[PDB]
Design a protein around this ligand. Structure first.
Ligand SMILES: CCN(CC)S(=O)(=O)c1cc(Nc2nccc(-c3ccnc(-c4ccc(NC(=O)NC)cc4)c3)n2)ccc1Cl
Ligand SMILES: O=P(O)(O)O[C@H]1[C@H](OP(=O)(O)O)[C@H](OP(=O)(O)O)[C@H](OP(=O)(O)O)[C@@H](OP(=O)(O)O)[C@H]1OP(=O)(O)O
Ligand SMILES: Nc1ncnc2c1ncn2[C@@H]1O[C@H](COP(=O)(O)OP(=O)(O)OP(=O)(O)O)[C@@H](O)[C@H]1O
Ligand SMILES: [Mg+2]
Lengths: 332, 310, 820
């Protein structure tokens, strides 16, 4: 991490990246900018702006790279860490365990009681055991970690309402963009919240284009729809501004999918992009199928409302959140 | 059932002109804590009364005939006499105590005492020392007003007064106010000399005359960097009373009088309030403590020792 | 430098280094570093340059001698902009620069031949410098900058006007008096297409950032009990017992031994927020042992006041002491201010209590161990008290016109109720959301509640979007299906309208909403029919609980005024409360006035109507103008209350009704003194709002049309030359018609089209088949929206045929062909 000074005496930090190609990140950022450009017209008659926060990255050859630094954003893992510290301090009167240790402390006795052991492979594990462990873990972490944070970070009720609406719209836009692209590995350290405006910004754009399904522990959820995220949207949940915003975003993307497909095709035929790090053709076909609405169907074309409902249901069922990586923190 | 006790319209006399206590300020005091005490010191025509009035409950646009602290009149200047006598008392609505003070070593008091110790000359000096010590032991801050720069005799008097004070030692903050400033005195070159002289003339004063009330940070000098001064002491300057091209006013070279007065008032009000004795005190407790201190200072021993030396 | 004036001030010397170039480019080092240690040299150089330039009219005519001075004005403007943009200037230098800038500006618009000089970049730099030099500690400098900006208000781009709007908004609430009036006039001189824009305000953002930074800091524990007592006395009773006291209090509450910007210390909004936060912090940190009483005494007092306000909200005929009666027009605004401060104080208290018993992360500092250990054991009592007073808090928030407070409280109450007060909470939350124009939240709540009879929420959701016709039809259908008797009234075809777009409390709410819906679209006949139907239903059902809360006298007065019958309008107005009709000025508003903004808006409208009828009767010059001008001036001064209150909180927007009322009052004040002889007597609502004000309903244009038709009719009683209002009226009517059609209001759109052209589908077809092309296109669009697509397409084709042989045919032929 470095620091630069401009003509206006402004501090512009950056970050170095060696031995890691950043050619794909530049294309991803360009795609995000093009997508955000489509919301210019709809932003003229709507208080919550339809924008997707992103940074700029520039490669310095084949392995080096300079990534911009975004300040003012706080990661979501900080809230959980602070809550754990506060709970430990309160319990002491009358360090904190890591997510892996905490998860194992509960998955051990359950497996021992059901008849299996920790030596068994993760794939050959009962579903009821994992579901019970997840339910027991969620009952301990309160869902007001993010809602109360935004409420306390404001000054007046009007400001609170404005930031709440902006946060809901930003979350919906980011979720739809991630689902279309196929971004994965969205843990608490890869999501940042801006207390000044309530917008959400991502960080690591590495596991994308449906790359998390081939890992050691595949993930099926399209985006992160944890308990805290849902509670921070209000009492309604995902049936208020979130659903409408998602539908509007999908309508905008589907109306102008020609330019997105052309940009993706151009990205595929790029000699400076290292896809392996016919794969590009498969990725383009998957993106085209998702945009056309035929995500999971032989020939039936799902509508915008049906697609939103199916995606939301697939990202909230307990059958998919239990069988996930320990570091993903599905209980907070 | 929570209305304020009362509002003071004019300052009262805390100490009679005969160096006698006047217990008549308890009617306007409460049982609240964290009180601030401000005192003033200066020569005869420096303008301590006007400064105290403008800093307590007055505005420059108001008239001098309705000030909280009586000021010198035009008919009095021609006779070369003083106006303020004894010690005054006044408390604003913010529970801030202001204490006035008669001129020290002024010829008016001497002349008035001529037609009324070995000679009637050391009495004025001792009265001035008594007032200085009292203000240095029962006040949170003391402001010294100087008509002209470098009198060369006020520093020695201040050191002597602090050396003969009544009594983990407490030393109130000292503020150097230069009244009736001119354009020549509002230059960085002269400012450096002023600060250097003030610092070198009070190297072993033991008082807090630096690190607080820095006019450099009060936007007085826009492009003057803080490093330009070796040691910025607490010194403030107060100026004298204050188709389209032809209507341009004259060039003064110094900020407006109202702006500087407001800045000085804000800085004085936003100052610290350290503890005086080894216990917490309230308004009534502070009044009783001040009365006891004055009584002890009157019948003190160090004063007699200094008296036999003159 | 002084000796050089002999040749510098010559009256017409061909030397190599020109005096202008020597004092403007050669001596450029005096402004870098010499201006800090030796400002006299810089002042002398600037003074001689100004004296030399003022004798040649700043070289405007030129922009031998003429050719040599062909680039002097640009250099002068660039120099002024660069110098003003600096932050290391002296008082004398800044004053001289401001005087020079003001002289140059006033000079700029005098000619009608200097228009091209507004496109060069130096002008933009000069404007930027003027805008960046305001908002300073000096008052005279700010006044000079405001006057200069107000001089050449026109000819500026949208960026400069947008920044000026934010500057005026932040300066509207100042401790002084001249600054407020100057900025108010400057703001009034800006068109509505920019004031009502949804652009972000930078000044408001900085204010919010400063407040957030101060709140995130550790507690100071310097707020004395006397300060808290004074604040409480001024909020609950209105008597502060202190003779600019906020700044003095803030300064006295600071410490130098142990960081809000100084320029922001002159604003009353920041000081009020700081005082409220400090009071809440003192109350929480003192174990609720405030001088007001014991721990329970404060809770009982707040509960009693909130309950009294809630009870008064149900029935306006209550006359709450110290909250509804004032002594003049100044106390009325103070009442609303006190109520807003009370709500903010309650919110801050709740935040502090939550942080005390639970804690935050990177937002608020953890309180001491004693405070936490005390609030942890007594958390249940606090939660119970908050839940018990939440119902009343919602009503109080709704009365004060603060839907955010009631929405937040309703959400918290709904969340706490995880186990017959469920319907009232949903009703209040729905109404609050409708006031904020958030149909998505309403739909979400409807869907959420459907999983627990409550199908009428969709009607309010549709109404929040601006569809009054569909909302009213749905309201009537729901009332008829829930009551059992036919409560329908005459209206437009249900099929065409749809194609285009059991408790007494619920019945009363639906009836009141329908009445308000009819009043919004300005349908007097519909209101009368609805009233008759409501009376018949109540008499045939013995409800004994339904009662419309709307003064019918005001509606009758509005109908009479709009119809042109001033004789009956005066008689109707003679019964309304308040001061008598003009034939004393400070106390215009009547006593026993509730703090509800609706009442204030009604009073302002009544005053405007009284002034209009008085002027019309007096006309058919200081005979009846000395009093009307004062009346309008007071009305305009009182109408600025809501705008000033909006700045107290970080709202990022301004009310539309209040802004329009203020603009209408200003227009009337200008027309009474000018007799329709200047362009300043017209409303600034132009067609430019079509592409920048699409987030507003059709109500904004109703007031503009109501006050414009009056002037149009009054034009027939003036013999002297006047301003052309026909074009303005036609443009305003067309824009309103487009806005109404976009929302499906076919009934109102038909009326607007008929008025501009001077209940069945066939009626529109048989009645319709500079502003010519626009009117034809609008008619075709309306016909298409009504369902007759073939007729609309045929008419558009014919219009295109006739437009192809026109003179310009630039924005008409292309638009018609694209639409077809
Ligand atoms: C609390 C600890 N933190 C969170 C982890 S943090 O880093 O310290 C922090 C981060 C921000 N925000 C921020 N802004 C700009 C950039 C990054 C950032 C950080 C780390 N990695 C990347 C990264 C890496 C690899 C690739 N590329 C590929 O993977 N494949 C091609 C792309 C991006 C980017 N983060 C704000 C505050 C803080 Cl505290
Ligand atoms: O009535 P107008 O002022 O002429 O607006 C029309 C049109 O309105 P309609 O949908 O009622 O025909 C659309 O306005 P919005 O729906 O965005 O509010 C807009 O875009 P769409 O037609 O795609 O909806 C655009 O029409 P276009 O984009 O084809 O140019 C615009 O026309 P103008 O910009 O030429 O005025
Ligand atoms: N800054 C100033 N500019 C102009 N005139 C001033 C200024 N300060 C004081 N004066 C005037 O000069 C005189 C100074 O006497 P003032 O009443 O201010 O108090 P003083 O000199 O401390 O009095 P005392 O003689 O009691 O010590 C008054 O007439 C006052 O109006
Ligand atoms: Mg005096």
């Amino acid at each position: 991490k470095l620091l630069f000074l401009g003509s206006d005496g402004k501090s512009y930090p950056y970050l170095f990246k060696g031995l890691e190609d950043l050619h794909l990140d530049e294309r991803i950022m360009q795609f995000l900018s093009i997508v955000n450009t489509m919301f210019a017209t709809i932003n003229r008659q709507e208080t919550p702006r339809f924008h997707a926060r992103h940074y700029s990255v520039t490669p310095l050859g084949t392995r080096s790279g300079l990534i911009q630094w975004v300040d003012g954003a706080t990661p979501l893992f900080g809230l959980y860490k602070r809550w754990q510290q506060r709970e430990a301090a309160l319990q002491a009167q009358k360090i904190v365990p890591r997510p892996s240790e905490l998860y194992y402390s509960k998955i051990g006795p359950a497996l021992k009681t059901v008849g299996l052991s920790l030596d068994v492979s993760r794939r050959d594990w009962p579903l009821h055991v994992m579901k019970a462990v997840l339910e027991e873990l969620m009952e301990a972490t309160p869902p007001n970690l993010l809602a109360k944070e935004l409420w306390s970070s404001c000054t007046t009720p009007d400001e609170w309402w404005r930031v709440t609406q902006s946060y809901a719209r930003s979350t919906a836009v980011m979720s739809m963009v991630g689902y279309i692209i196929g971004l994965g590995d969205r843990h608490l350290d890869n999501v940042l919240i801006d207390m000044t405006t309530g917008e959400v910004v991502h960080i690591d754009y590495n596991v994308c284009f449906e790359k998390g399904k081939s890992l050691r522990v595949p993930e099926k959820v399209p985006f992160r729809m944890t308990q805290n995220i849902e509670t921070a949207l209000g009492v309604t949940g995902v049936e208020g501004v979130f659903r409408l915003s998602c539908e509007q975003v999908l309508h905008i993307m589907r109306r102008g999918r020609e330019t997105l497909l052309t940009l993706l095709e151009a990205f595929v035929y790029d000699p400076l992009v290292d896809w392996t790090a016919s794969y590009a053709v498969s990725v383009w076909k998957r993106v085209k199928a998702k945009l056309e609405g035929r995500d999971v169907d032989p020939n039936r074309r799902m509508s915008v409302a049906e697609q939103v409902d199916y995606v939301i249901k697939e990202a909230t069922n307990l059958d998919n959140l239990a069988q996930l990586y320990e570091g993903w923190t599905a209980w907070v | 059932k929570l209305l304020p006790p009362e509002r003071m319209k004019h300052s009262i006399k805390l100490v009679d002109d005969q160096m006698n206590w006047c217990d008549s300020a308890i009617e306007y005091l409460l049982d609240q804590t964290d009180v601030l005490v401000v005192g003033v010191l200066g020569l005869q025509g420096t303008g301590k009364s006007m400064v105290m009035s403008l800093l307590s409950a007055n505005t420059p646009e108001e008239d001098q005939r309705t000030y909280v602290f009586r000021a010198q009149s035009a008919e009095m200047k021609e006779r070369g006499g003083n106006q303020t006598s004894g010690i005054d008392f006044f408390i604003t609505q913010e529970r801030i105590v202001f204490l006035d003070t008669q001129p020290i070593l002024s010829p008016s008091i001497l002349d008035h005492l001529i037609n009324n110790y070995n000679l009637p000359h050391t009495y004025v000096e001792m009265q001035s020392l008594q007032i200085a010590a009292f203000l240095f032991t029962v006040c949170h801050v003391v402001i010294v007003v100087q008509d002209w720069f470098t009198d060369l005799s006020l520093y020695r008097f201040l050191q002597t007064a602090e050396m003969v004070k009544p009594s983990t030692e407490y030393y109130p903050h000292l503020v150097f106010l230069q009244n009736k400033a001119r354009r020549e005195d509002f230059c960085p070159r002269k400012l450096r000399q002023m600060h250097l002289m003030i610092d070198q003339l009070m190297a072993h004063s033991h008082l807090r005359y630096k690190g607080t009330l820095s006019m450099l940070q009060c936007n007085v000098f826009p492009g003057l960097p803080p490093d330009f001064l070796d040691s910025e002491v607490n010194l403030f300057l107060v100026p004298f009373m204050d188709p389209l091209f032809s209507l341009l006013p004259g060039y003064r070279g110094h900020p407006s009088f109202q702006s500087l007065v407001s800045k000085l008032r804000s800085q004085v009000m936003s100052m610290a309030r350290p503890q005086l004795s080894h216990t917490i005190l309230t308004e009534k407790n502070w009044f009783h403590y001040a009365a006891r201190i004055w009584d002890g200072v009157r019948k003190s021993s160090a004063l007699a020792e200094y008296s036999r030396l003159l | 430098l002084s000796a050089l004036t002999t040749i510098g001030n010559a009256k017409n010397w061909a030397l190599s280094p020109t005096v202008f170039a020597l004092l403007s480019k050669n001596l450029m080092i005096v402004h870098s570093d010499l201006a800090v240690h030796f400002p006299a040299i810089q002042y002398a150089v600037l003074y001689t340059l100004y004296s030399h330039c003022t004798r040649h009219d700043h070289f405007i005519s030129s922009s031998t001698v003429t050719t040599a001075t062909k680039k002097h004005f640009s250099i002068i403007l660039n120099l002024l902009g660069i110098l003003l943009k600096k932050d290391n200037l002296n008082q004398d230098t800044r004053k001289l620069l401001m005087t020079w800038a003001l002289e140059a500006a006033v000079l700029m618009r005098k000619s009608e031949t200097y228009a091209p000089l507004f496109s060069l970049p130096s002008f933009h730099k000069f404007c930027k410098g003027l805008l960046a030099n305001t908002l300073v500690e000096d008052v005279n400098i700010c006044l000079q900058a405001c006057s200069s900006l107000h001089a050449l208000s026109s000819s500026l781009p949208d960026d400069l006007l947008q920044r000026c709007v934010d500057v005026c908004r932040v300066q509207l609430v100042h401790s002084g008096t001249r600054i407020r009036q100057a900025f108010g006039k400057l703001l009034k001189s800006i068109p509505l297409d920019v004031v009502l824009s949804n652009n972000n305000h930078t000044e408001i953002q900085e204010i919010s950032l400063a407040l957030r930074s101060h709140m995130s800091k550790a507690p100071s524990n310097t707020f004395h009990p006397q300060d808290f007592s004074d604040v409480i006395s001024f909020i609950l009773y209105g008597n502060s017992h202190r003779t600019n006291w906020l700044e003095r209090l803030f300064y006295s509450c600071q410490r130098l031994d142990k960081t809000i910007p100084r320029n922001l210390l002159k604003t009353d909004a920041v000081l009020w927020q700081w005082a409220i936060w400090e009071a809440a912090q003192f109350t929480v940190l003192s174990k609720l042992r405030t001088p007001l009483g014991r721990a329970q005494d404060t809770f009982q007092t707040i509960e009693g006041i909130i309950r009294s306000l809630a009870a008064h909200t149900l029935n306006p005929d209550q006359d709450v002491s110290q909250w509804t009666t004032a002594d003049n027009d100044e106390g009325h605004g103070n009442n609303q201010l006190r109520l807003v401060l009370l709500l903010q104080y309650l919110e801050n208290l709740e935040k502090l209590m939550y942080n005390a018993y639970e804690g935050c992360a990177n937002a608020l500092t953890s309180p001491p161990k004693v405070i936490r250990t005390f609030f942890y054991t007594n958390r249940q009592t606090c939660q119970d008290w908050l839940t018990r007073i939440r119902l009343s808090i919602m009503r109080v928030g709704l009365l004060a016109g603060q839907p955010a407070v009631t929405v937040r409280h309703g959400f918290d109450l709904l969340t706490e109720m995880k186990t017959n007060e469920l319907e009232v909470t949903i009703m209040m939350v729905v109404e609050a959301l409708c006031e904020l124009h958030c149909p998505e939240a309403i739909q979400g709540i409807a869907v959420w509640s459907s999983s627990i009879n409550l199908l009428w929420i969709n009607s309010v959701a549709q109404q929040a979007e601006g569809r009054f016709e569909k909302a009213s039809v749905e309201y009537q259908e729901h009332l008829c299906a829930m009551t059992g008797v036919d409560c329908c009234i005459s209206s437009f075809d249900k099929s065409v309208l749809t194609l285009a777009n059991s408790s007494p409390e619920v019945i009363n709410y639906l009836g009141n909403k329908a009445c308000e819906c009819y009043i919004s679209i300005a349908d007097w006949a519909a209101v009368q029919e609805w009233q008759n139907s409501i009376h018949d239903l109540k008499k045939s059902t013995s409800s004994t609980s339904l009662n419309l809360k709307a003064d019918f006298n005001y509606i009758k007065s509005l109908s009479s005024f709009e119809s042109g019958k001033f004789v009956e309008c005066t008689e109707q107005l003679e019964l309304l409360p308040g001061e008598n009709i003009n034939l004393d000025m400070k106390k215009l508003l009547p006593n026993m006035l509730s703090p509800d903004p609706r009442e204030l808006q009604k009073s302002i409208e009544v005053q405007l109507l009284r002034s209009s009828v008085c002027l019309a009767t007096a006309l058919n010059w200081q005979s009846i103008t000395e009093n009307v001008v004062k009346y309008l001036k007071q009305t305009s001064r009182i109408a600025i209350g809501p705008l000033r209150l909006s700045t107290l909180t970080v709202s990022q927007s301004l009310p539309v009704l209040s802004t329009l009322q203020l603009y209408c009052s200003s227009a009337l004040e200008n027309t009474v003194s000018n007799r329709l002889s200047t362009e300043d007597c017209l409303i600034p609502l132009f067609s430019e709002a079509l592409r920048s004000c699409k987030q507003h309903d059709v109500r904004p244009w109703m007031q503009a049309l109501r006050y414009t038709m009056y002037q149009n009719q009054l034009l027939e009683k003036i013999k002297e030359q006047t301003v052309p209002i026909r074009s303005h009226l036609m443009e305003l009517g067309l824009t309103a018609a487009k806005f109404a059609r976009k929302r499906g209001n076919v009934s109102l759109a038909t009326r607007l089209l008929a008025q501009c052209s001077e209940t069945t589908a066939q009626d529109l077809v048989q009645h319709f088949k500079k502003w010519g092309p626009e009117l034809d296109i609008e008619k075709t669009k309306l016909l298409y929206t009504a369902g007759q697509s073939t007729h609309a397409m045929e008419m558009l084709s014919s219009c295109a045929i006739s437009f192809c042989k026109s003179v310009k045919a630039e924005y008409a032929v292309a638009k018609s062909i694209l639409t077809l």
